[PDB]
Write a protein that binds this ligand. Structure first.
Ligand SMILES: [Mg+2]
Ligand SMILES: [Mg+2]
Length: 342
C-alpha cells in the first residue's frame, strides 16, 4: 500500500564520429580512404541488487549520462564500443517514461537488468562512402545521439525495522527525525489506517525503511481479509529498535518498561521475540537518567546492544542507525511458515 517514486534524467552515450583519412605512404603517391568508424555510445542500464531497499540514491543524483563511444581513427582502425553505465536499483522497481508513460522495465530479480537509455550507433568513416565516381571520399558520419529520456522509478515499500516501546517515549519523534522521507499511499482516503513508516538513511550510504510496529501489528488484526497484507509486511520487518525511557516524567523503573513491552510482543505470537533488538535509552539529558542506565545495563541479560543518546538529533543518532544497518544485513526475514509444503 506504500510506494516510493523518484524522477531522473538518463542519457545514453552519443557514440563516436567516423574519421576522414587517407593512406599516405612514402610511395611517391597519395590516396585511398582510411578513416575508421566510430564506436557505439554506452547504454544507461538498470540492474537489480537485493542488497538495496530504498530509492534514496536517486535522490542525491538525478542525472545519469553514459560515456560516448570511441571516435574513428586513421589506418582504417575503428573505435570500440563504450562501456555501459550500470545503475543498481532495489528489487521490484518499475521504470516508466515520464512522457510516453510507458513501462521501460519491471525489474524484480537479482541480477536482472534492463536497457533504460540506449547509446547511439557509431558513425561510419570515409572508407565506407567510396564509390567508382568518388575514390577519395571526404564524407563521414557523426555519431548517432544517445537517447535521452525523463523517467520515474516506482518501488513497493515494506518496513525493515520496527519501533516498539511505551507511547510518548520517542518512537514517533525519533522515527521522524531520521525519517529522511515518507512513502505515498495507494488506497488513500478510506480505512485511512496509514501505519507510521519512513525511509531513514545512515551516514555511509546505506538505507532502510523504518516503522512503528504497533501500527503494523494492529492492521494485521483487521477482518474481512485485510490482515494478511500486514502479516506479510511484518515478516519483512527484520530488526526491532526498542526505545525505553531513563528518566520518567511520570514513569518509573527502566528495566520494567523493557519487560512490559517485550512481553506483549511475544503474546501476539508473531515471532517478534526472535527478531534482533537494539535498545535505545533516550531522555539521557535528565539527571536521574545518568544512574538509571547504570542499573538498567545490569538487570539486562539479553545480548541486545544498548544505544543511549541525548536530545534526539539527526547527528546524535549516527552510531545508532549504523548498528540498525549492520544488524539488518545479518538478520533473515521472519515468515510465519517455511517452504514445507510437499
Ligand atoms: Mg551521510
Ligand atoms: Mg483478515
Amino acid at each position: 500500500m506504500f510506494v516510493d517514486q523518484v524522477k531522473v534524467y538518463v542519457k545514453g552515450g552519443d557514440g563516436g564520429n567516423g574519421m576522414v583519412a587517407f593512406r599516405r605512404e612514402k610511395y611517391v603517391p597519395k590516396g585511398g580512404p582510411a578513416g575508421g568508424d566510430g564506436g557505439k555510445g554506452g547504454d544507461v542500464v538498470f540492474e537489480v541488487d537485493e542488497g538495496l531497499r530504498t530509492l534514496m540514491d536517486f535522490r542525491y543524483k538525478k542525472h545519469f549520462k553514459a560515456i560516448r563511444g570511441e571516435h574513428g581513427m586513421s589506418k582504417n582502425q575503428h573505435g570500440r564500443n563504450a562501456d555501459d553505465m550500470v545503475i543498481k536499483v532495489p528489487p521490484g522497481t518499475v521504470v516508466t517514461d515520464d512522457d510516453t508513460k510507458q513501462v521501460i522495465a519491471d525489474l524484480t530479480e537479482h541480477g536482472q537488468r534492463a536497457v533504460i537509455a540506449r547509446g547511439g550507433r557509431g558513425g561510419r568513416g570515409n572508407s565506407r562512402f567510396a564509390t567508382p565516381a568518388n575514390p577519395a571520399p571526404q564524407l563521414s558520419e557523426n555519431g548517432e545521439p544517445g537517447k535521452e529520456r525523463y523517467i520515474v522509478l516506482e518501488l513497493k515499500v515494506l518496513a525493515d525495522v520496527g519501533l516498539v516501546g511505551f507511547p510518548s517515549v520517542g518512537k514517533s519523534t525519533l522515527l521522524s527525525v531520521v525519517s529522511s522521507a515518507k512513502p505515498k499511499i495507494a488506497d488513500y482516503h478510506f480505512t485511512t489506517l496509514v501505519p507510521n513508516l519512513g525511509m531513514v538513511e545512515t551516514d555511509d550510504g546505506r538505507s532502510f525503511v523504518m516503522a512503528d510496529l504497533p501500527g503494523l501489528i494492529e492492521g494485521a488484526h483487521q477482518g474481512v481479509g485485510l490482515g494478511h497484507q500486514f502479516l506479510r509486511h511484518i515478516e519483512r520487518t527484520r530488526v526491532i529498535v526498542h526505545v525505553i525511557d531513563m528518566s520518567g516524567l511520570e514513569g518509573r523503573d527502566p528495566y520494567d518498561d523493557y519487560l512490559t513491552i517485550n512481553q506483549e510482543l511475544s503474546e501476539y505470537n508473531l515471532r517478534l521475540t526472535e527478531r534482533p533488538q537494539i535498545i535505545v535509552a533516550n531522555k539521557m539529558d535528565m539527571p536521574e537518567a545518568a544512574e538509571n542506565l547504570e542499573a538498567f545495563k545490569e538487570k539486562l541479560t539479553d545480548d541486545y546492544p544498548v544505544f543511549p543518546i541525548s536530545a534526539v538529533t539527526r547527528e546524535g543518532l549516527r552510531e545508532l542507525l549504523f548498528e540498525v544497518a549492520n544488524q539488518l544485513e545479518n538478520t533473515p526475514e521472519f515468515p510465519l511458515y517455511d517452504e514445507e509444503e510437499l
